[PDB]
């Protein structure tokens, strides 16, 4: 589909960040590629594995709420708390309500439920700091396409192209879009920036943003064989 | 096994 497509166009824009060796130029200017109009729309700031059960539930940073079940299906639950979409393994989305759900969707609405009151009360808010960008007044959410774990992260793939990579050593973050050809760097003390992959390539980046960067790679190329 | 506290 076009999120195949996406994967393709991220991973060939980390190729060519990386084969610059941004980090190893005479004079880094990582300022120079600072684009805060690039801010993402949506991020995951909060998610809860429960994989060996039913799946992986998460929060947008709007503060709506899906789950990925083991069976590779798909329930969002809009910031409105009534708006529901389902998305079936192959995509396939229907719009529903939870005052008119289905009831073969009782237990994964129970589960969605489940997973929502938990993270309201649980954990941080990741980017709490960071105001998104916009989107247009009655646009879709994307829904989580994939997701794994590794040692040194979790990787999130978003049905918009997104991929989020968080690091559990220090709580740096990445989210990558390959439509804005952009990375935000979330630091390890929390601060933020947006750059234009394209002008870190062209004025470099410091070691720690580099060292993800190729890392960011890897989970891309990842995503794709898979 | 969650994200950030």
Not at chain 1, 148 to 159: D, G, K, N, P, Q
Request: aromatic residues 10%; contains cysteine.
């Amino acid at each position: 589909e076009a999120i195949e497509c996406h994967l393709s166009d991220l991973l060939q824009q980390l190729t060519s960040v990386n084969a610059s060796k941004p980090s190893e130029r005479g004079l880094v200017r990582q300022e120079e590629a600072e684009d805060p109009a690039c801010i993402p729309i949506f991020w995951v700031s909060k998610w809860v594995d429960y994989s060996d059960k039913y799946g992986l539930g998460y929060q947008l940073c709007d503060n709506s709420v899906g789950v990925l079940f083991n069976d590779s299906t798909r329930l969002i639950l809009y910031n409105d708390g009534d708006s529901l979409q389902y998305i079936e393994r192959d995509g396939t989305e229907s719009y529903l309500t939870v005052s008119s759900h289905p009831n073969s969707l009782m237990k994964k609405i129970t589960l969605l439920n489940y997973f929502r009151n938990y993270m309201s009360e649980h954990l941080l808010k990741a980017g709490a700091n960071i105001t998104p960008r916009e989107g247009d007044e009655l646009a879709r959410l994307p829904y989580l396409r994939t997701w794994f774990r590794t040692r040194s992260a979790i990787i999130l793939h978003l049905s918009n192209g997104t991929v989020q990579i968080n690091f559990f050593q220090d709580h740096t973050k990445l989210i990558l879009c390959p439509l804005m050809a952009a990375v935000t760097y979330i630091n390890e003390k929390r601060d933020f920036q947006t750059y234009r992959l394209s002008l870190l390539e062209e004025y470099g980046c410091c070691k720690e943003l580099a060292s993800r960067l190729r890392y960011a790679r890897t989970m891309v190329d990842k995503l794709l064989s898979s | 096994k969650t994200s950030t506290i």
